[PDB]
Amino acid sequence: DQFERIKTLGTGSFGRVMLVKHKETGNHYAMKILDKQKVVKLKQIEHTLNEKRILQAVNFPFLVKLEFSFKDNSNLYMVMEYVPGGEMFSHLRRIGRFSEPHARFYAAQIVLTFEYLHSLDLIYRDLKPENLLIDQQGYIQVTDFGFAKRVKGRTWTLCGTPEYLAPEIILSKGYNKGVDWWALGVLIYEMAAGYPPFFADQPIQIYEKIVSGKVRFPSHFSSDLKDLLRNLLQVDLTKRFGNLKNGVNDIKNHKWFATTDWIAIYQRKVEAPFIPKFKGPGDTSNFDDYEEEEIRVSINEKCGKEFSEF
Amino acid sequence: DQFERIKTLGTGSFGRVMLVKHKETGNHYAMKILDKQKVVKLKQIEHTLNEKRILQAVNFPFLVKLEFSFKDNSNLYMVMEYVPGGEMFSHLRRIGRFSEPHARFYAAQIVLTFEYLHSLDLIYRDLKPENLLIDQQGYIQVTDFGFAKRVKGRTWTLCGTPEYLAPEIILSKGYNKGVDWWALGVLIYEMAAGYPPFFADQPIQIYEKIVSGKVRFPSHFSSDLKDLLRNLLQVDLTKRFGNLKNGVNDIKNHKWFATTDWIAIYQRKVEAPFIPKFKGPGDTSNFDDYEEEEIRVSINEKCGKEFSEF
Amino acid sequence: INRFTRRASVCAEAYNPDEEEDDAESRIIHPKTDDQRNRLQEACKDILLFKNLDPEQMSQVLDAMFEKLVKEGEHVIDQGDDGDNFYVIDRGTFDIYVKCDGVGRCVGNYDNRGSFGELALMYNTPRAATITATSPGALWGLDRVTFRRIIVKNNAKKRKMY
Amino acid sequence: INRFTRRASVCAEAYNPDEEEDDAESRIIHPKTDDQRNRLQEACKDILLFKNLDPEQMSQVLDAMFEKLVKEGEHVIDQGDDGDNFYVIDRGTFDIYVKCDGVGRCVGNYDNRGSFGELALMYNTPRAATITATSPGALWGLDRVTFRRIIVKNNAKKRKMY
């Protein structure tokens, strides 16, 4: 416990994350506690092992550093670099909807990270708007990578979220990329219409809408992406025109997507279209007013022989 | 020292209904308990004084003959009749779509109770799905009558239908008893379409939908109901069907009520379509359950002169 | 089958129509400039309540309007407590945070428009929002007591005069 | 603007039929009468899971079934513990009382009609609600472990051979 805590940063099914100050240098960093309670109550050691094996030899601009990792007799704390700025979903909900350049940059970053993951045979798995961090220099970062896999192979994993699924995952059918593409067709919708994509008071309606691929043309939508949205939803994948294995010779040759200078985007140089307003060390204006829950340290050994790989 | 409580039946933002049993004879009954702590802060003695006279103003079958109330140092109790059956809101939520006979019977009962309330010129004021209980005898009963009041002049105490509020009162203006139909008209939608009327959560959207004269008509409504809903669509409901001489001509002579007979129901002798199952005394299975909450209040006087009339 | 909703009782403040005695014309007096008054009128015209009001009531509210200067890092209004005030962001930007199961999620801000706590004047209800300072600014508005009093007085005058 | 519900994960046991366990072809068939199977097929031939399935898998699922006699008044399932079973509506009135924020409320009574409990087979989710038995009856206790194992094994064998 060589880290002085300050204030909690987030709590959810994924776990708990707090803010700490490096005693050996003095810098704000994030500390994620594995807890292991829900892991033992829900069996989630395979995902953690896969994420560890992946991070053991994986490093790219769209990834968070792994600096010092601490395991106790019954707990584990992973340290990471903090990126003051907040998630983009908060700003999207505060304003309403972004413009066409914003969606273009989002799609460019998505295809870039997809190509980066495919270069080393990897699958993103989970994808939600609550896993993005925008710094002051424009360097975007992604968090939450436990839902991944070393090699694609051919398994039958079931996870994610009900709001991002396809018929291939409901009845496992490999979905080596459909889960990462079909669901993506709805992501843009969340950043286009003035209301959430799925709005129903029962999961049966959501399942029926996911199975019955049909996008409802909003009352105010650009005619450029209309044709793309009218075909993004499909069953198979070979029939899709823009779906080459390279993934660069299809999105660049699109109608609206043409001037996407990826050479300057992948090199981290072009500034983001919306930089957050800073104020001081560890800003909180962009983040929510969440409070801190009851914290508890370790007492004795209970499940220390779990991650027996270090 | 007469009635002993058993368990709780349901608490709200005004009172708590619970089950009680007499110590002398022994019979299950309902008892509404209220705490003056919340009334002193809001100051609502005018609405409570009406119950003192409504207790005696009862000379009809529909009018529930309330029992004698009892005021304590910091709590009030009022015993009422027992309802082995349940509420209509629960049945509607369970089914969500009534047939033709059931809808006709409900409309006839609504018209009968409205005529009964108008005969005495007693403003109903309060109106919600919870104010409709189904007795074991196969009839309908109304609860919560404290909001009733008859004043020569106008009024301004806005309290009763916050969601189903006509656009004539949202602007802080007067109103008449005819509004009781409007606030209830939307309810018929729940017994026709299958989903709630307002498909939103923010009050702004509800107000915009109420002010915006537009109501859908799926392929599930009747023939006369469609015309009745289309006739009432303007913002300033000036051509109301209730604001007439007797108020029982255009509604009874309408095509919806092709066959009616109020004399048969006046004497109470027509079996309901389906009476709730009565599994002997204490059949509280139809009603919704609730956590137990005893009376934890200190025996101390708190403004007695303010609660003299009772 | 459905998420469902609560059926909580709603409340509003009462009044005694028999009490005709009131202020001479207005208690708070603060005549602003012409540009500020025009901007406030244009911002209020977008509200549904100001669609049927006459110029007389508009001028009365403008003359009786109350201005409050909020500095940086200031905090007065808080959630949970019974709401008893109302203001309008005349300029600047202030993000509002609303509770969401123990998480003060954001809703947005306003810029020379909007109305923080516009529904609180329609009925008495606890504070369902949380405001936070950002920079020096001025907010124009009126509390619920005086607003309701003026509204009821105008209603009674329009009802009895005719 | 909206309550904004949470978006928790829906992970579960990663069933990798390749080198797991030791047994093989553990079908464990439980035959019964023909009238019961014929009556259950009418409802089984309309679910989203059975609307697009091989006849062999449907026949195997219909053959594999365990019965459980439940009398009146028995809290076999309660909102709180983890959920691993799929109950079929065979006969008898069963009330679905959900603890909406710690308050019991009837969702939808089932009487030899409808279909429920399939959600438990979608992913790891706790008990949906309390299933109160108003009278004696015989329900179908289909555990989650059996359903994915053959349903994935048949597909794997077909993909390996065909």
Numbering used by the authors:
A (entry chain B), B (entry chain A): 96 to 405
C (entry chain C), D (entry chain D): 104 to 265
Which lines from the publication concern this structure?
The mutant is translated as a stable protein where the J-domain (residues 1 to 69) of DnaJB1 is fused to the cAMP-dependent protein kinase (PKA) catalytic (Cα or C) subunit (PKAc) (residues 15 to 336). In its resting physiological state, PKA exists as an inactive holoenzyme, which is composed of 2 C subunits and 1 R subunit dimer. All 4 R subunit isoforms share a similar domain organization which consists of an N-terminal Dimerization/Docking (D/D) domain followed by an intrinsically disordered linker that connects to 2 tandem cyclic nucleotide binding (CNB) domains. To provide mechanistic insight into the functional consequences of the DnaJB1-PKAc fusion protein that might allow us to better understand how it is a driver of FL-HCC, we used single-particle cryo-electron microscopy (cryo-EM) to determine a structure of the RIIβ holoenzyme formed with J-C. This is the first cryo-EM structure of any PKA holoenzyme and also confirms the differences between the compact RIIβ holoenzyme and the more extended RIIα holoenzyme that was shown by negative staining EM.
